[PDB]
Ligand binder design. Structure first.
Ligand code: HEM
Ligand code: HEM
Ligand code: NA
Ligand code: NA
Lengths: 713, 713
């Protein structure tokens, strides 16, 4: 059936903002997964998982009698989709079980891994999510094989449909670079926000870049994609060499034997795929990647044999039984055990990308250090595996259960504990009055709190106003944050703060994080007053102030808004139209279309635009909270045309007189163009809507202010 | 951005069932449009709309100084998308304002018509929906031009996104038939459920079939598409001649002048389209369809001049200024006024399709009657216009406001008023106990009530258990309803009914509609009992029993379930896969994916299958309400293969022994295959799920039982 997408493939898609409704969710609207999990007997789950490790099923027999390797790969692929650019992907939503990730080529036969866990999932039911279970199974596999983990946190709630993520534009699985939808240009520059070299791969190609088996050039791709997953060189070497301490690859025959991936398979395959016509199709005969490598002499036990082999042999380029490039140790004895035949052994083998750890000069130094100092290796890999599998979980307040590590890590963007009484309602009213008496404007107050709060993204739950990181590097210098104006607001709030705190008894004090947000509430209340309305804006104290030392400047860089339609800001030219960038930002903020609508209409009349631009300021009473934006946008007495100078700025003129009334951007005008957005603007631009507009605005404002407040969850 | 639909274009689409969530609705969750509308000053709206008719706006000047014809066309197109095969389309949701209908070529310049309404929509806000307003505006246009309408009901609540409708498979607007995606086959047989000849047309081509200007052959396409919109020959002639009493068509120059439709237009167009480069692009120079016909000597006043002209002249083929085929009376004087120049007149003209009303033999008899007796014409047209514009509104209980016609029309599937006291909670318990003591089985009870209630479709709100039409023709003979079995159940319930009613004092009695539902509730309660659980199934009395005289048998035919996955029933072979037909039935029932899941898994183990098929009956305790369907479907100990005899029936065998355990259809096994549905099945198949399964079953059961109960709204 022909769809709207077919007729108008370039129209904006809003259904990303209405994903994950109560309609698709089988659990009741008050189901709280954290509460369910906190009562789970996690020790009992771990016992079952230990028992599963050596309980081989005949439809997918365990290599070496132990599913540990398979489960470690499973959990690493669960986490391995993460991109620091947008926070999307990662293990935190258990998206490995839905399309498209369940059917990516690099996830081949992880459908079998997930099926092996159904009896445990079924036993514990709602008290352990798939998302948590995948990770927990990875940890138990490590532990079962003699590797002490750093810890584990539960709390990843299950999801019920695919996440809308941009995974690239290629229309061919695994397409090599330089095609019509190439993700590479220039000197092998991978397009943001992508973090994989080919469509359907986790990070890199194990044969080498575009299949060329050059470990030096493969190292460049490893370093770039791991960095785009938040990992440095030390973590990268620890993760790859730690993971390939275990298990094996699967390439026993030609890949042509493997049939349809799970989304393409017949109904009778009951959710599984990649059924293989090669011999038994499984076990000794398994084909997954097409490579046939077993790294160590004890593939079901933690050892130091990875780096012994990597350094201890010279390597020769060979081909697996499926035809894939791989390496074999020159002159070695047959020391590597077979997965199924006790009487067979083979020579040590490596992937191209394992050799990168020796032949890239920076990796080589780290690899050598880990070879000479195996305790450092073990500790780095323990830390890196915890980071891998928790990087998208957000603040530590979300972490549940008895195995959470007490050590606070830099990457968690930590927020100090609050150890003093919080301001009360009377103190808040006092501080708001101070703020409004300082001479700070509506615009200033609203802009600052928006700047502080709107860094949040729900994809990985980073950002938000807690921590008062707007006063630190790098946020204080972001162009969207108007650094000179920002500094003058923070100076004035800091003096208010110091005066208030210096007057208190007991240990009562307000943080700057809380004051920034309360000040913005005061600005919204003053704006309402300016429009003739009595409005109280909710405020929840309890934020604390992070230090510079608790704020990794390079990791914060990915939170910078280079496009923020809510401040009519675009830092440069993008190929994606500005209204598409708006919808993307609304999605990261967790807003619906109605919420995005109301929020933007309000912010325009409150003076939140960067640079005091007039674009979209469709009111004669700036800094008053009204629905003027909508009423004026929708006035058919105004005719709109793109300007001569810039086709993304428009002038609105009186259709009768030709007089200039307004200017606007695409972000502004899209609310008068797009037929779903226009229908929302009409609600808010009606004669009976001023109250509804104010109430709805205050609600979304408060929502944004509280995005990161998982301490109150 | 490559999507899942790109990689797997034939996978089942569930997002149809999660449309219209609370996420996308700008109105609060307690907004009740009926309550809003009941306090609208309807008379005031109609005054504003009357004034509008003659208040020309320079961006779309009114023909003849009067927008009445434009508004008539607007409201006819709003209603004219309706199809009786599925109930989809129609004016009841205001979908003309969304894609794709806002941009259909037959909807050209209706965007201007909707924009002329915004000031009124704005004035009255949420108290009149767009959906009601479009229709009301057509009524006021009629009335302002001297035509007495039959009535008007409000209550069509607005929607906030496009409806998912199959409008055809063609990939080119207006594609002539016989293409690669032809909607015709055989001897010009149009595919169900479509009701238009070309993609983007309301019903037929005004030039004739695929542009052949033969009025005789055009009449066959009129008859077929009107019939697919539930109109007979009398109603069709009345509607066409009545609508073409007014206004004109627009074809002043070549169609190449006309630019992008609204969804393709630039952002500066602010939701309008079809901008024309022909001269002024509007008014005297307007181009819409490309035809240039003005039917009567008084295009702004009700008259009988359509038929005077049609019969009074002999007609000759000519071409409009855009090159379209049309007809002119060459022997006539210049008697037809120009729309903008008071000094110009022209000859009478007609469309091909207008001439069908004289040259088709069955039409000609009716047109002749209406010519000779224009009072009969006026009355047929008023009745047909009311039917046209209310056909999708559902039961009369939904009709709001002061202009509802008191006459009860057979097409409305009327339900008699209830004039007696209703049974109370103790009476319901007594009746449940009597039903269960009769010997009627859980399976009988469940199946009967499912059969009675599951005719409902939310597309046009027809069907459901109110009326007890399951005892009447044609429902009592539908093969899905198991007519011999059903008759035995209805006999037993009827005797229970007569006994209970004969024992009452003071007028209290129960309807058979209510008893059929209540007996079903007893069956569900007994099934829960059989599983070891005491539950009470909610029941709301107040249904009444319709007679055979109040039931149009021919109109009921479209409600026959020919595919009902909930009873594992397919009346024949279809090219559409059975699981697709399940999701389509779930959508018509207003079910979300979780509701569909729970409901189907319960009905399987209750014995609701047609013919007591064992397909999907994955339980050893049939007639007990358990989660067995899910537990057994998901058991990896069972392996599934298509049968040799039928590739859509599957055998489930023990993986170890080969012992035959179960059989299923695609409808059953989709729940173990599809990655979203299987995630749902897992919830209800988990060890902690027995309570949740029974509670969710009872809720969805009760939902289905109450679908048509707009008397309790
Ligand atoms: C440069 C990055 C990486 C590359 C290119 C890569 C490549 C692969 C390939 C091709 C396989 C074989 C799949 C099969 O045929 O069954 C595999 C297996 C595996 N990888 Fe990696 N790997 C990477 C990083 C990781 C990381 C970070 C971890 C975990 C910390 C990991 C742990 C595993 C383990 C445990 C297996 C064995 C699976 C089994 O025993 O069934 N690898 N790797
Ligand atoms: C066989 C069915 C019909 C055909 C093929 C048809 C065709 C058309 C065409 C091609 C136009 C010209 C559009 C334009 O160029 O502006 C139009 C105009 C119109 N039609 Fe129909 N029509 C049909 C049935 C109806 C019915 C059922 C009604 C209402 C009861 C209706 C009422 C009107 C009115 C009022 C106009 C004039 C619009 C104006 O004044 O701007 N028609 N018709
Ligand atoms: Na994420
Ligand atoms: Na409908």
């Amino acid at each position: 059936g022909t769809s709207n997408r077919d007729w108008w493939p370039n129209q904006l898609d809003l259904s990303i903002l209405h994903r994950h409704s109560s309609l698709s969710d089988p659990m009741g609207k008050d189901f709280n997964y954290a509460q369910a999990f906190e009562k789970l007997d996690l020790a009992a789950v771990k016992r079952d998982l230990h028992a599963l490790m050596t309980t081989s099923q005949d439809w997918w027999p365990a290599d070496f009698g132990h599913y540990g390797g398979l489960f470690i790969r499973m959990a690493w692929h669960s986490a391995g989709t993460y991109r620091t650019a947008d926070g999307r992907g990662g293990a935190g939503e258990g998206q490995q079980r839905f399309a498209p990730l369940n059917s990516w080529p690099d996830n081949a036969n992880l459908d079998k891994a997930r099926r092996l866990l159904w009896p445990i999932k079924q036993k514990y039911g709602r008290a352990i999510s798939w998302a948590d279970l995948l990770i927990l199974t990875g940890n138990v596999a490590l532990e079962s094989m003699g590797f002490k983990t750093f810890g584990f946190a539960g709390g990843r709630a299950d999801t019920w449909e695919p996440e809308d993520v941009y995974w690239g534009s290629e229309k061919i699985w695994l397409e090599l670079s330089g095609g019509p939808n190439s993700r590479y240009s220039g000197d092998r520059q991978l397009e943001n926000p992508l973090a994989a070299v080919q469509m359907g791969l986790i990070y890199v190609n194990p044969e080498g870049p575009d299949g060329n088996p050059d470990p030096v050039a493969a190292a460049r791709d490893i370093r770039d994609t791991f960095a785009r997953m938040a990992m440095n060189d030390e973590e990268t070497v620890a993760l790859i060499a730690g993971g390939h301490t275990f298990g094996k690859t699967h390439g026993a025959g030609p890949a042509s034997n493997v049939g349809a991936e799970p989304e393409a398979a017949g109904i009778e395959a009951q959710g599984l795929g990649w059924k293989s016509a090669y011999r038994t199709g499984k076990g000794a005969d398994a084909i997954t990647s097409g490579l046939e490598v077993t790294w160590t002499t004890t593939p079901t036990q933690w050892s130091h044999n990875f780096f012994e082999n990597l350094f201890g042999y010279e390597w020769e380029l060979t081909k697996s039984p499926a035809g894939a490039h791989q390496w074999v140790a020159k002159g070695a004895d047959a020391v590597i055990p077979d997965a199924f035949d006790p009487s067979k052994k083979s020579r040590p083998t490596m992937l191209t990308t394992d050799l990168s750890l020796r032949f890239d000069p920076a990796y080589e130094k780290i690899s050598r250090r880990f070879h000479e100092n195996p305790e450092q290796f073990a500790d780095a890999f323990a830390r890196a595996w915890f980071k891998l599998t928790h990087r998208d979980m957000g603040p530590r307040a979300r972490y549940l259960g008895p195995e959470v590590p007490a050590e606070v890590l830099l990457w968690q963007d930590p927020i100090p504990a609050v150890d003093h009484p919080l301001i009360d309602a009377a103190d808040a009213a006092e501080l708001k009055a101070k703020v409004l008496a300082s001479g700070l404007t509506v615009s200033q107050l609203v802009s600052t709190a928006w700047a502080a709060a709107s860094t949040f993204r729900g994809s990985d739950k980073r950002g938000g106003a807690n921590g008062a990181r707007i006063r630190l590097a790098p946020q204080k210098d972001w162009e969207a944050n108007q650094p000179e104006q920002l500094a003058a607001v923070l100076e004035t709030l800091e003096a208010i703060r110091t005066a208030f705190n210096g007057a208190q008894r007991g240990g009562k004090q307000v943080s700057l994080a809380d004051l920034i947000v309360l000040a913005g509430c005061a600005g919204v209340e003053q704006a309402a007053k300016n429009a003739g309305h009595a409005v109280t804006v909710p405020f929840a104290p309890g934020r604390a102030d992070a230090s510079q030392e608790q704020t990794d400047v390079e990791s914060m860089a990915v939170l910078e808004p280079v496009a923020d339609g809510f401040r009519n800001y675009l830092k440069g030219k993008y190929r994606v139209p500005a209204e598409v960038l708006l919808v993307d930002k609304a999605q990261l903020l967790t807003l619906s279309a109605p919420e995005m609508t109301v929020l933007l209409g309000g912010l325009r009349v409150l003076g939140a635009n960067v640079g005091q631009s007039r674009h979209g300021v469709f009111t004669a009473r700036e800094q008053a909270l009204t629905n003027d934006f909508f009423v004026n946008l929708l006035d058919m007495g105004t005719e709109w045309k793109p300007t001569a100078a810039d086709a993304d700025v428009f002038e609105g003129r009186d259709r009768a007189t030709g007089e200039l009334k307004w200017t606007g951007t695409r972000v502004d005008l899209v609310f008068g163009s797009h037929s779903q957005l226009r229908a929302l603007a009409e609600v808010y631009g009606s004669a009976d809507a001023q109250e509804k507009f104010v109430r709805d605005f205050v609600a979304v404002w408060n929502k944004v202010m509280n995005l990161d407040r998982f301490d109150l969850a």
